[PDB]
């Protein structure tokens, strides 16, 4: 993690309704960041992504969904803990992700 | 993991004739003119 | 009495007759084990559930240790990985390089042990220790060599039946567990052998040579054979039935089958 | 002394009988006495020690069985015990049971001379038993008398120390005759070294009466004023 | 002999979170959700005041603190709708980011190769003959095979590897002779040496494959006659 | 349903089907499926990065 | 190191190699070997069917 | 000598045994066991033998040991991985 | 000043044998003096007594015999008796002081037993002695008919009314039974098998019974001390020590003997005194591994100025031990004779555990290849972490005890084995490395 | 910068992009990087050479070993892992499932059941 | 890294477990990269604290193999390094003190005098050159003698080493250290029989009683 970075925290500064569940880890390349978005906001965060100055230049390499109904922990259940991302995905439906 | 570089540019290698790994072959007039084609929108 | 004790900086509370292993079972953390088990009596013979205590300076048998009042437990320390490596170490010394032709290939917890907690290459390079087999009877198939002397199946027979017939004959490397003298281990309850001998040297023999475990797929049930009603499960690879063993169903059936 | 199992014996067969005479009988109602009555399982080494002597130097199957069934103990104990400790002979041994000690003491002091002589005097190898019943060599480990060094042991009874090429030789023809020196083959002592004493050279002292008399009334009542003055 | 550290103690697993408050709500909108203050009291001074003591002393964050959590940066300035200054300062990190982050690559971006473009331009038969980097890739690719062929003619020979039948023998070596023999008479092998004393030789002996030699130079073998 | 027999499978044996995706970028398949478990595990392989062979046959890949 | 056709060998005695651990089948990507295997009445570990699905196996 | 007696099933491992080895011509589709069962039992001067079927290792099986040191004397012992046979050479 | 010790302050009296060791001499000596006053002064006396004379265990813990006899039960309220093991076993290598009163002075032995007993509120004492010692355990056994013929054990016990009993257990040859829960088990018939140590067996250990296990010569010495004086013994050592000690030499020395001598005396000193010193000279000295064989060697850098004392020799990083004394010659190998060690170490394990039952073998493997030449440098290390490995992971401290002495030799004779491996590579070449197993020796 | 995945950031070579994006250019560069391919592997593969011999005092000439596999060739793959990773290529040379208990395990579990992969999500790319 | 302290738990000197392998490897490439002494030195300046003696003799052996001209950046960069991590060097740092010393040599490295008596205190002072294979010994003592550098003790050592293990000489290594001893003019009549035939007999070869009374170590 030797590089240069910074949060994309113009989107929660812009869409001030929203609170702010983000996350970086070493298994993602050093300029990679995850966060939570809303479905009911995100037709709006990606008009905002579209044509943001700084944001402008933004290519949608991804998109995909995971059935988080049956994800379990099998193995070190124990070592969860409460800012990992897979809390969210037990008792949810699904999860649509796009990068 | 990662490292640390203070220099980001890699300088090129000496070209003083005295210095050992000196090519004087490396250039060739007749086809190295790429400067005369080289200025053409 | 309830007391505080930390598991990894983890606050927890357990009553004084919690030892170190249950209170870490309780809080989820698993500890390593060959021989020590839940119906049978405490023994530290293999002394895999070494953990580290910050005030002991020796490393604690988890198993037979029971909790104090602010004791901090290390179980993710480098101590306690060196200390789970050496005695896996020594274990996996003389330990007969069978796993290709023994039964328990899949459902080796020594395997898996050495797998999660141990080191991933051995330094012996010697000859291994050679004991000769013996003759339990049709529902029993022993390969001694692969033996551990943790003494489960000695304590089994001694406790959960009447029969007293195996025992840890000799001293030192030489030792070996099982009947002096050349006799079958006919008891009723001879399968539950099998299940609590935890390496291996001790087999199905009528099951032997026959799947592997990660090609069945298991039922839960219930027994017929007796009146009584026994809580097992049933493993089919396809059409074909094998190696039926119990559940726990502490109420009726309390581990063991027939 | 070499298998941890039973070997496979003709002579040794479960139809072998073994009888306690009277007078171990009364030696076992001794043993049983000073041990409690309840924990009659602590007797399995003294019976083992008198099938032993009742036998020829060695604990039959049938002798282990009957103790167990004596004790009201699993024959298994009985076969874990005899396993576990190498005093007792498993199998037959031969008239003398020579036990060369091989401990560090006793290989600075020589030991590999003396068990070299031994073999040559018997025509045998260690630990193999001679041709004929007479003579079973065997290595052990420190027994005792170190100091003496080297040393051997006859029949788990008799310790002959300060052997040498010839004074082992000289051993073994007068255990073959039937009378022999019991002890040290030099002219030493119990432990008093070759050269000689380096202490207790009063002799008047060592021979007169030695008293030592203290007022122990006097003591306790002094540790019970310093006792109360703490308090 | 050295296992221990053969696993790697130290791992490239780490994970940081980031978690803030959304940026519209006030301090009395943030009191109210987290149930500190009332919903009548927001309009008592001394109320809100005494709810936001309780907030700063049980939460650990002054209730205009916006960050629940900052593992990845552990930012101490809130960006809030109260402090417009926030927006500024975060603007002025977010082009300072901007210039820095451009500036630490090393191919991606250059204003000197944006000002001085290179071209390679196809002007020859050969495309290597246009770029004089090719030119020097063909002249050493030709010096190490010079280098080599060189080298080999020097040593005169090569050596090679040659199967040996024997090498599949029922028994190893550290087996007696006498017995690596009868194993072999009663499998009915005769293509292998079985002679008792070479046996013997060989007995607990470790020694590498049989080797032969191709002899230069390389020729057709002809019946000129 | 190359996904979902590789969700099937266990990892190993659901490389293959990352020759299969490409048939002439096998070795780059292999190379991102290799480099995405060896990320999980938290490791990198330095076997590989030594002996060069993971970008002169990427590179001969792309030839 | 090329592989073609799939093969099972014997030791120089004319014993089988094969003992029938399911290595084999349990990494069979393609699940294309079906093993199953009964003690030999001398006492071996030995398979008593051993079939490969050369259609449905990648080599 | 009838395979489904007591004393065969005792010492052949509870198993029923075939004197001519033939039925395994079909049950396991080879005649290994009576291509193994022409090898004569070799005779180890120690106690313990060890195996790897073959000259070198990685040529064989995995490298194992077998007691000789039998509870009754000179009895043969079977290699699990290959059928050769082992016994201590009594002298 | 520490040493030459005066024949009038030896507590073992008449250790060569001179005068009759049965009843009649052991009363002319003096034994048997005042016991039924020692018992009548009170247990609470006998302890405080004890601890004030500073008289620590003359086994290899060296704990303080006074706290040690104090920890044991008041009274129990269940009725369990309580029970007075002495551990007269003696297998350790090099010590022979214990069977050296036995046979002198059984007597002394059951004089201090009784009154130990009568301290500890024990109603036996189980004199527990390894089978080598036939001669020595019959000498015992006809003390202790003695004794109950005189009156002095048994019912009122010399005339104090305190009803004891004392027996014996001639056990076998095991090296693990001097073990404190390998003793109680040998005792209760059971396998010499060391028992785990949350129990703290003066709380639960022979029969479940409150049992204390003691060394044959702290139960002997405490009579004497008693009738003596505490003062008079914690006069004859230096602070923190006990006092006079009975050492034994048996190395390569000119007069090898067993001798009572005063606590903190130099090492050099006591060979070149009671023993004649080594056989070539001082010059001539290799090593000395004093403290029996299980604590680490001591090259002669450190011989010289080093005192026989329990905090001096754990400082300098060999222990005093069962104070025996083995001298190593430069003749001897210490290769050789540390591998003798592991051979005895290996034989002698009980097997419970899986660390020492296999390090043992593991290590005895490795001394023997160091010895014969055909090893890496780097097995050195290896062999060194391996005994790391082994001990502190065992139950009953054998594998401590097995692993201090290839330590000592590794961390002192490096340079000998490494040229010892150099020594062998030069005259066997081998570029090819096996796969396979070393060759059986 | 935190993309590279393998020796390449520490490579010299040239990546080409075209002013118009039309398939003539996506041509020449497809044409250009299978040349420079070329390159990067020349670079790779005397990354792994050992260039440089020993040379006599008195002559001052190259000392070839007669009987030495390094004299065949002047390309040596397991030079730099030999060089850094000492241990570690030593173990895998010298261990194997065949007379190591840990390896065996290793191998039955690898093949039986592939190896455990900690829970987490990663997104990696080529 | 974040939270990571990169003090040696040896004290002595770092270890390439304690570093992330991502590091080691990132690093060992940078290395390999450099093509100068300038570049090198900045790059091991940078990267101090994540340094290991391997990749420190490694980038010996890369300026070595590639001839890169040892300069000014050299000399008052580079070196203080080598002399700290050489100081800092013991029994089990063989392989980095042999492969350092012999391709200075190699490099003849004509100035670092302080660099050449660290190195010949940790051979011959510290008695560190009987932890050095033979072969690598061989080549320690050709390359400093192609540098010029040595001492009369540590030739004489090499040459009773060498006739130590006459039986394990190879007719490559015999081919160097016989170059090499000629060259210096150092050596003996037995030192030159043994190398003309290494397997000779012990009365074949005179001397090898009186060498063998020595007993070299
Ligand atoms: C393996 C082992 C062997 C022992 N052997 C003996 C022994 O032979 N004799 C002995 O007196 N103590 C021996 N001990 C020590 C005893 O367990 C115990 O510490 C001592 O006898 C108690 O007396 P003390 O408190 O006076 O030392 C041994 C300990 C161990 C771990
Ligand atoms: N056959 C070889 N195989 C692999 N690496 C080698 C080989 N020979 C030399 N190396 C490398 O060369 C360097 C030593 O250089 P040098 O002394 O010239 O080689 P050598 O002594 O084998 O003739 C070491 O990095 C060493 O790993
Ligand atoms: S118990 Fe069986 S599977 Fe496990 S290591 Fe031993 S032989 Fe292999
Ligand atoms: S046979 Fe199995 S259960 Fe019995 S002692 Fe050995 S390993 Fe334990
Ligand atoms: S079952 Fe498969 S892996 Fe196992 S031995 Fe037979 S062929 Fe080999
Ligand atoms: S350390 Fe050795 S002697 Fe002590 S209990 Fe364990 S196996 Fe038995
Ligand atoms: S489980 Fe703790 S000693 Fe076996
Ligand atoms: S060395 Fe012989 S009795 Fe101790
Ligand atoms: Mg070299
Ligand atoms: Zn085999």
């Not at chain 9, 014969?372 to 401290?397: F, K, R, S, W």
Request: proline share 4%; hydrophobic share 35%.
């Amino acid at each position: 993690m030797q590089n240069k970075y910074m949060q994309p925290i113009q989107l929660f500064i812009v869409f001030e309704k929203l609170n702010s569940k983000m996350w970086i880890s070493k298994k993602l390349n050093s300029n990679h960041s995850i966060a939570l978005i809303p479905s009911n906001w995100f037709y709006s965060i990606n008009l905002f992504l579209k044509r943001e100055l700084l944001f402008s230049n933004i290519t949608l390499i991804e998109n995909s969904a995971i059935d988080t109904i049956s994800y379990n922990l099998e193995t070190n259940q124990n070592d969860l803990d409460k800012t990992n991302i897979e809390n969210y995905f037990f008792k949810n439906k699904m999860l649509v992700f796009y990068n | 993991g990662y490292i640390q570089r203070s220099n980001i540019h890699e300088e090129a290698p000496n070209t003083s004739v005295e210095a050992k790994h000196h090519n004087k072959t490396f250039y060739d007039p007749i086809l190295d003119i790429d400067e005369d084609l080289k200025d053409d929108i | 009495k309830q007391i505080e004790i930390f598991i990894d900086g983890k606050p927890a509370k357990v009553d004084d007759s919690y030892t170190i292993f249950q209170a870490c079972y309780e809080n989820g953390v698993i500890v390593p084990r060959f021989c020590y088990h839940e119906r049978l009596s405490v023994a530290g013979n293999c002394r895999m559930c070494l953990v580290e205590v910050e005030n002991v300076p020796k490393p604690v048998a988890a198993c037979a240790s029971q909790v104090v009042p602010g004791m901090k437990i290390k179980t993710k320390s480098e101590k306690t990985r060196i200390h789970r490596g050496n005695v896996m170490e020594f274990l996996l010394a003389n330990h007969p390089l069978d796993c290709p032709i023994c039964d328990q290939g899949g459902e080796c917890d020594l395997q898996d042990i050495s797998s999660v907690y141990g080191y991933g290459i051995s330094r012996y390079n010697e000859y291994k220790r050679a004991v000769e087999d013996k003759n339990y009877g049709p529902l029993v198939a022993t390969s001694m060599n692969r033996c551990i002397h943790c003494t489960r199946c000695v304590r089994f027979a001694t406790q959960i039946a009447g029969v007293e017939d195996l025992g840890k004959t000799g001293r030192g490397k030489a030792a070996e567990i099982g009947t002096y003298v050349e006799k079958t281990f006919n008891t009723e309850l001879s399968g539950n052998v099998v299940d609590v001998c935890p390496v291996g040297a001790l087999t199905n023999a009528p099951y032997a040579f026959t799947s592997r475990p990660w090609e069945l797929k298991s039922f839960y049930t219930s027994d017929v054979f007796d009146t009584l009603g026994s809580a097992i499960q049933v493993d089919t690879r396809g059409p074909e039935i094998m190696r039926v063993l119990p559940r726990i169903h502490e109420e009726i059936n309390e581990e063991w089958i027939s | 002394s070499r298998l941890a199992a039973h070997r496979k014996n003709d002579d040794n067969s479960d139809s072998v009988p073994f009888e306690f005479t009277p007078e171990n009988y009364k030696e076992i109602e001794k043993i049983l006495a000073k041990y409690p009555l309840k924990q009659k399982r602590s007797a399995v080494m003294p019976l083992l020690y008198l099938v032993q002597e009742q036998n020829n130097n060695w604990v039959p199957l049938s002798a282990m069985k009957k103790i167990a069934k004596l004790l009201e103990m699993p024959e298994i104990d009985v076969y874990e015990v005899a396993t576990f400790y190498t005093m007792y002979n498993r199998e037959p041994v031969g008239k003398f049971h020579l036990q060369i000690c091989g401990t560090t003491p006793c290989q600075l002091c020589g030991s590999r001379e003396i068990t070299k002589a031994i073999e040559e005097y018997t025509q045998t190898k260690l630990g193999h038993t001679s041709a004929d019943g007479k003579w079973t060599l065997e290595e052990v480990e420190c027994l005792g008398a170190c100091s003496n060094a080297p040393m051997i042991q006859v029949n788990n009874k008799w310790v002959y120390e300060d052997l040498t090429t010839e004074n082992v030789v000289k051993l073994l023809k007068d255990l073959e005759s039937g009378t022999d020196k019991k002890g040290p083959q030099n002219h030493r002592n119990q432990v008093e070294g070759p050269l000689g004493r380096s202490t207790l050279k009063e002799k008047d002292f060592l021979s007169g009466e030695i008293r030592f008399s203290r007022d122990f009334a006097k003591a306790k009542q002094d540790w019970v004023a310093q006792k109360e003055q703490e308090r | 002999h050295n296992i221990r550290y053969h696993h790697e103690i130290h791992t490239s697993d780490q994970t940081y979170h980031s978690s803030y408050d959304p940026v519209g709500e006030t301090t009395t909108e943030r009191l109210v959700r987290y149930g500190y203050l009332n919903k009548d009291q927001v309009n008592n001074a001394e109320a809100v005041a005494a709810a936001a003591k309780e907030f700063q002393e049980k939460e650990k964050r002054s209730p205009s603190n916006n960050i629940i959590i900052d593992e990845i940066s552990n930012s101490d300035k809130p960006i809030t709708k109260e402090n417009r200054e926030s927006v500024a300062h975060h603007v002025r990190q977010q082009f300072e980011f901007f210039r820095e982050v451009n500036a630490e690559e090393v191919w991606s971006v250059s204003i000197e190769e944006k000002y001085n473009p290179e071209l390679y331009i196809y002007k020859t038969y050969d495309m290597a003959a246009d770029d004089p980097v090719w030119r020097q890739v063909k002249l050493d690719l030709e010096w190490t095979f010079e280098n080599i062929a060189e080298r080999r003619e020097s040593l005169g020979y090569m050596p090679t590897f040659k199967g040996d039948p024997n090498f599949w023998q029922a028994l190893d070596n550290s087996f007696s002779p006498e017995n690596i023999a009868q194993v072999q008479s009663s499998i009915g092998d005769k293509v292998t040496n079985i002679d008792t004393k070479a046996l013997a030789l060989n007995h607990q002996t470790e020694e590498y494959h049989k080797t032969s030699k191709l002899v230069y130079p390389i020729r057709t073998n002809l019946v000129v006659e | 349903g190359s996904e979902k027999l590789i969700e099937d499978r266990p990892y190993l044996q659901g490389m293959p089907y990352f020759d299969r995706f490409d048939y002439v970028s096998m070795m780059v398949q292999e190379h991102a499926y290799c480099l995405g478990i060896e990320s999980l595990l938290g490791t990198t392989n330095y076997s590989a990065t030594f002996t060069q062979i993971r970008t002169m046959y990427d590179e001969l890949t792309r030839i | 190191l090329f592989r073609g056709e799939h093969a099972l060998r014997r030791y120089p005695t004319g014993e089988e190699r094969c003992i029938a651990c399911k290595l084999c089948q349990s990494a069979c990507p393609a699940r294309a070997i079906t093993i199953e295997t009964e003690p030999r009445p001398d006492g071996s570990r030995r398979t008593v069917r051993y079939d490969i699905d050369m259609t449905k196996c990648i080599y | 000598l009838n395979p489904y007696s007591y004393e065969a099933l005792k010492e052949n491992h509870w198993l029923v045994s075939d004197s001519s080895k033939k039925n395994s011509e079909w049950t396991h589709k080879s005649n290994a066991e009576q291509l193994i069962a022409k090898v004569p039992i070799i005779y180890v001067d120690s106690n313990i033998v060890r195996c790897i079927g073959g000259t070198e290792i990685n040529a064989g099986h995995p490298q194992v040991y077998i007691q000789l040191d039998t509870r009754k004397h000179g009895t043969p012992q079977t290699c699990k991985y290959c059928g050769l046979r082992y016994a201590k050479k009594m002298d | 000043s520490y040493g030459n010790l005066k024949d009038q302050d030896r507590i073992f009296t008449n250790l060569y044998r001179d005068g009759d060791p049965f009843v009649k001499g052991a009363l002319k000596r003096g034994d048997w003096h005042q016991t039924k006053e020692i018992l009548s002064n009170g247990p609470e006396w006998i302890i405080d007594e004890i601890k004030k004379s500073g008289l620590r265990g003359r086994g290899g813990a060296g704990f303080l015999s006074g706290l040690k006899y104090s920890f044991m039960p008041k009274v129990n309220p269940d009725g369990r008796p309580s029970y007075l093991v002495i551990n007269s076993d003696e297998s350790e290598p090099g010590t022979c002081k214990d069977r050296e009163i036995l046979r002198n002075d059984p007597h002394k032995l059951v004089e201090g037993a009784l009154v130990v007993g009568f301290s500890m509120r024990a109603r036996a004492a189980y004199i527990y002695i390894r089978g080598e010692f036939w001669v020595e355990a019959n000498i015992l056994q006809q003390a202790i008919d003695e004794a109950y013929a005189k009156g002095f054990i048994g019912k009122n016990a010399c005339g104090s009314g305190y009803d004891f009993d004392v027996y014996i257990h001639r056990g076998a040859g095991a090296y693990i039974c001097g073990e404190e829960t390998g003793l109680i088990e040998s005792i209760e018939g059971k396998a010499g098998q060391p028992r785990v140590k949350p129990p703290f067996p003066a709380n639960a250990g022979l029969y479940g019974c409150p049992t204390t296990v003691t060394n044959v010569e702290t139960v002997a010495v405490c009579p004497t001390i008693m009738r003596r004086g505490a003062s008079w013994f914690a006069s004859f050592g230096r602070p923190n020590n006990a006092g006079t000690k009975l050492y034994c030499i048996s190395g390569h020395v000119n007069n090898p003997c067993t001798v009572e001598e005063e606590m903190s005396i130099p090492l050099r000193e006591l060979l070149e005194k009671h023993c004649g010193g080594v056989r070539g000279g001082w010059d001539n000295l290799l090593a000395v591994i004093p403290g029996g064989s299980s604590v680490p060697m001591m090259p002669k850098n450190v011989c010289d100025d080093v005192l026989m004392d329990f905090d001096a020799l754990k400082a300098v990083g060999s222990g005093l031990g069962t104070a025996a004394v083995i001298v190593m010659d430069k003749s001897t190998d210490p290769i050789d004779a540390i591998l003798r060690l592991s051979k005895f170490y290996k034989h002698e394990s009980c097997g419970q555990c899986t660390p020492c039952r296999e390090g043992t073998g593991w290590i005895v493997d490795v001394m023997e290849r160091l010895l014969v030449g055909n090893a890496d440098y780097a097995e050195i290390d290896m062999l060194q972490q391996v005994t790391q490995q082994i001990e502190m992971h065992t139950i009953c401290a054998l594998g401590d005890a097995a692993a201090w002495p290839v330590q000592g030799l590794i961390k002192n004779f490096r340079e000998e084995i490494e040229d010892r491996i150099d020594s062998y590579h030069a005259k066997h070449p081998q570029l090819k490395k096996s796969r396979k197993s070393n060759p059986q020796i | 910068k935190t993309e590279t995945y393998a020796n390449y950031y520490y490579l010299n070579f040239r990546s080409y992009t075209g002013q118009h994006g039309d398939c003539y250019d996506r041509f020449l560069i497809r044409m250009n990087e299978m040349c420079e391919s070329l390159n990067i592997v020349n670079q790779s593969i005397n990354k792994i050479s050992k260039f440089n011999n020993i040379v006599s005092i008195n002559t001052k000439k190259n000392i070839l070993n007669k009987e030495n596999f390094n004299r065949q060739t002047t390309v040596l793959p397991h030079l730099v892992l030999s060089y850094l990773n000492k241990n570690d290529y030593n173990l895998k040379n010298t261990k194997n499932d065949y007379n190591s208990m840990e390896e065996l395990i290793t191998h039955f579990k690898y093949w039986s059941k592939g190896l455990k992969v900690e829970s987490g999500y990663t997104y990696q790319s080529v | 890294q974040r939270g990571r302290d990169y003090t040696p738990s040896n004290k002595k000197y770092l270890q390439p477990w304690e570093l992330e392998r991502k590091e080691y490897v990132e690093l060992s490439l940078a290395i390999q990269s450099a093509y100068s002494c300038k570049m090198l030195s900045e790059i091991l300046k940078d990267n101090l604290y994540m340094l290991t003696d391997y990749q420190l003799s490694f980038a010996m052996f890369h300026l070595w193999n590639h001839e890169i001209p040892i300069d000014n950046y050299f000399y008052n960069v580079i070196s203080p390094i080598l002399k700290e991590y050489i100081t800092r060097f013991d029994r089990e740092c063989n392989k980095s003190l042999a492969e350092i010393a012999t391709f200075l040599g190699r490099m003849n490295v004509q100035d670092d005098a302080a660099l050449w008596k660290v190195i010949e205190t940790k051979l011959v002072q510290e008695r560190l050159y009987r932890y050095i294979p033979l072969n690598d010994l061989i080549d320690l003592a050709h390359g400093m003698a192609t540098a010029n550098r040595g001492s009369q003790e540590f030739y004489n050592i090499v040459e009773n080493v060498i006739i130590k293990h006459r039986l394990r000489l190879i007719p490559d290594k015999i081919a160097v250290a016989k170059d090499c001893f000629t060259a210096r003019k150092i050596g003996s009549p037995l030192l030159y029989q043994v190398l003309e035939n290494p397997q000779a007999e012990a009365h074949e070869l005179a001397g090898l009683k009186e060498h063998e009374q020595l007993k070299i170590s």
